[PDB]
């Protein structure tokens, strides 16, 4: 299990910019512009444009509030008039340079519209968002705009009994089948297009009730799925339906410890400036006995692609003679491959679209959407497993250290408004710091990263507002030792400026900078006076930031024992000399000790010169 966050930053001790509109709640949708300087917020009954560099600067505002006759219609359907019967923005996507595509629950009448960016006024397109947007603010939902066409995963109805992964195309509308083999009680988590003869694919991530597994209760299972951008459906069968829909198990577990995380919470696509293949960073929690635990598994796209392209499918079979069981299909697979895209191979066999695929192949995919092979993580284990924390959303920044060693920086939000910064150091997790983003411990519902030159920020939304944080707080570190010991690839010590700087931001010289991810503060170069009355009591204040260090006191060059009657420890860090007399005068030193590898790192926290009067 991952250790405790090395340093805890109170909302008070760091520079965090906040945004909220009075009487406006549920800041669940976040979208930043092309230029990255304008962040758009989708809340309950409102859409805003804020300066992404200072979220507190409100630029534009637009509302989409529900009428009383629509609220009462919703309430008459036994829903909560002042809770669920309101317009929760669920779809906030780029449409053009001059517009956004917006959908809201709208007292259970999913409605879509175009937000005119030049005016920040809605165009009144008033489209029926049934299938595109959920009815209930409680229902799961995911959407990705690909080539001005919305690819959405949510419920097709009011009750949330009909799930749907569909494309609102207008030219070629396509949707999933309303069948258990296709989708079995899913809870949508994330979707994105993975761009390139070879066609683009639109991946979907969700948790659904498993068909392959049987246990005491119904077992959930994380799913990775994909569809082909060029899909047009089948001609005779799969009319207006996906022909390219294949899914597989997403497995996040440490078995030598019986830890299985079968509930997917978030998915982030690490788009490597260097690496040609994207890495999905997926966030999971266990369905069973969650108390709570969180795990972060990283999946190489190539792995998943290997399953969808060459993996054996699963067959459903009748078993004695009213039951259905699912097993590996070892029978003959049709050609062209069921679920495959219109690639170079297909085009050679005179196949231009799904509309001209053989009925043999189309029937196969319709009856075999599920793959036998699981999609496994890189190094076949989670990147991080944490206890006593319920992680909510994830973002990852691939950063180059001073050394040139590349670290994948994990920003993980909690259900209590906190953000953890973690890196997988040499075969062990290091949680650099934790920051309390929300003073009200509101769970971070959404998280969004901008790693772009200048505007390097993380944006977190909750029901109470939005928070803007940098990727590091290098300046909070006082000494070179403190700067190095942090083991943050973002932070380096600058001897000329006598400040711990943010490497890859500051205008300090690279060649003349200090950073050691080993934590060996050895690479570094290197008195509060008091006058108290006789008989009186002294409180010598001492504090440090490491949650992984312990402090001890020293008087007259010896390790002082804070025991009654002469001594006491107030708050485990502040020394208390009780009965002051001639001999108590002199130097009192507060020291810290923290283990890095095998070695211990002692640091002098406080220096005190106590003088007792006569």
């Amino acid at each position: 299990f991952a250790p405790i966050p090395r340093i805890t930053w109170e909302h008070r001790e760091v520079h965090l910019v906040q945004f909220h509109e009075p009487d406006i709640y549920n800041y669940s949708a976040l979208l930043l512009s092309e230029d990255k300087d304008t962040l758009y917020i989708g809340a309950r009954e409102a859409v805003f444009a804020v300066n992404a560099l200072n979220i507190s600067e409100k630029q534009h505002e637009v509302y989409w509030k529900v009428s009383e006759d629509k609220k009462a219609k919703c309430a008459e359907k036994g829903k909560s008039k002042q809770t669920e019967c309101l317009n929760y923005i669920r779809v906030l996507q780029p449409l053009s340079a001059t517009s956004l595509y917006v959908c809201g629950t709208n007292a259970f009448q999913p409605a879509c519209d175009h937000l005119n960016l030049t005016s920040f006024k809605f165009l009144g397109k008033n489209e029926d968002g049934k299938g595109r947007c959920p009815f209930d603010p409680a229902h799961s939902y995911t959407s990705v705009m690909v080539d001005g066409e919305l690819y959405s995963g949510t419920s097709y109805n009011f009750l949330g009994s009909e799930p749907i992964i569909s494309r609102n195309s207008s030219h070629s509308p396509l949707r999933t089948e309303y069948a258990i083999p296709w989708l079995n009680e899913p809870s949508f988590v994330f979707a994105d297009v993975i761009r390139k003869g070879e066609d683009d694919r639109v991946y979907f991530f969700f948790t659904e009730v498993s068909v392959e597994y049987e246990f005491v209760f119904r077992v959930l299972i994380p799913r990775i799925a994909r569809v082909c951008k060029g899909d047009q459906g089948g001609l005779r069968t799969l009319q207006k339906k996906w022909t390219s829909f294949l899914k597989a198990r997403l497995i996040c577990s440490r078995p030598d410890s019986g830890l299985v995380f079968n509930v997917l919470r978030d998915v982030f696509v690490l788009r490597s400036p260097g690496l040609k293949v994207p890495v999905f960073y997926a966030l999971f929690t266990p369905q069973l006995n969650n108390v709570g635990l969180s795990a972060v598994c990283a999946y190489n796209l190539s792995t998943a692609e290997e399953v969808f392209s060459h993996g054996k499918y699963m067959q459903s079979t009748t078993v004695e003679q009213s039951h259905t069981k699912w097993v590996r299909y070892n029978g003959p697979v049709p050609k062209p491959r069921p679920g495959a895209c219109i690639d170079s191979e297909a085009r050679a066999a005179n196949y231009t679209s799904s509309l001209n695929l053989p009925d043999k192949t189309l029937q196969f995919v319709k009856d075999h959407p599920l793959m036998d092979d699981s999609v496994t993580p890189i190094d076949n284990r989670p990147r991080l497993i944490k206890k006593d924390v319920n992680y909510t959303q994830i973002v990852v920044d691939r950063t180059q250290a001073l050394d040139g060693t590349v670290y994948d920086v994990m920003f993980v939000s909690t259900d209590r408004g906190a953000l953890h910064k973690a890196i997988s150091l040499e075969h062990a997790v290091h949680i650099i710091e934790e920051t309390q983003l929300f003073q009200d411990f509101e769970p971070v519902q959404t998280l969004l990263l901008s790693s772009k030159k200048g505007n390097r920020f993380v944006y977190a939304g909750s029901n109470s507002g939005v928070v803007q944080a940098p990727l590091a707080f290098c300046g909070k570190h006082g000494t070179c030792e403190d700067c190095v010991l942090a083991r943050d690839p973002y932070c380096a010590w600058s001897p000329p400026t006598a400040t711990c700087v943010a490497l890859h931001q500051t205008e300090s010289p690279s060649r003349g900078l200090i950073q050691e991810m080993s934590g060996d503060a050895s690479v570094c170069p290197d008195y509060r006076q008091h006058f108290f009355k006789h008989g009186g009591t002294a409180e010598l204040k001492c504090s440090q930031k490491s949650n992984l260090a312990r402090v001890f006191w020293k008087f007259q060059n010896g390790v002082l024992k804070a025991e009654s009657p002469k001594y006491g420890l107030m708050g485990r860090k502040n020394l208390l000399i009780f009965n002051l007399s001639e001999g108590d005068s002199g130097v009192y030193q507060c020291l810290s000790e923290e283990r890095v590898k095998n070695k211990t790192v002692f640091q002098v926290v406080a220096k005190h010169v106590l003088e007792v009067k006569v």
Binding site: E162, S322, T324, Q363, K366
Partner: protein
């Protein structure tokens, strides 16, 4: 070897509708009960249900419908059939009566009642009039 039942009715505009009780056939993943238009705006689109006008059942092989009769009374279409009672540990085949509003195009009003004669001593329904 597998029965199909039908019922010709009218829509709200007097248009001709056909209610179908298609029993499960071992591809046949077709909904067990549907409302298909007999003569729509495009006559080439006849015998099609509106994607909404069906009884979506997720595990047809398990329920294994066996239709007997379909009929109407008042503003309702009724269906007589056998299917496995999966609520029972026995998962044994049981006789049922089914009812949907003639106007209901989403099968919202659809309701099933088990039939008993006498306390299931004669469990299998064969015919009715």
């Amino acid at each position: 070897a597998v029965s199909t039942v039908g019922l010709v009715a009218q829509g709200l505009a007097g248009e001709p509708l056909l209610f179908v009780g298609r029993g499960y056939t071992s591809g046949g993943g077709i909904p067990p009960i549907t409302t298909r238009a007999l003569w729509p705006p495009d006559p080439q689109a006849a015998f099609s249900y509106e994607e909404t006008a069906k009884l979506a059942v997720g595990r047809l092989s398990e329920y294994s419908h066996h239709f007997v009769s379909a009929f109407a009374r008042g503003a309702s279409a009724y269906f007589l059939f056998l299917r496995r009672d999966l609520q029972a540990q026995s998962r044994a085949f049981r006789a049922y009566v089914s009812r949907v509003c003639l106007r209901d195009q989403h099968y919202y009003s659809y309701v099933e009642l088990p039939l008993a004669c006498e306390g299931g001593r004669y469990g299998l329904i064969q015919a009715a009039a």
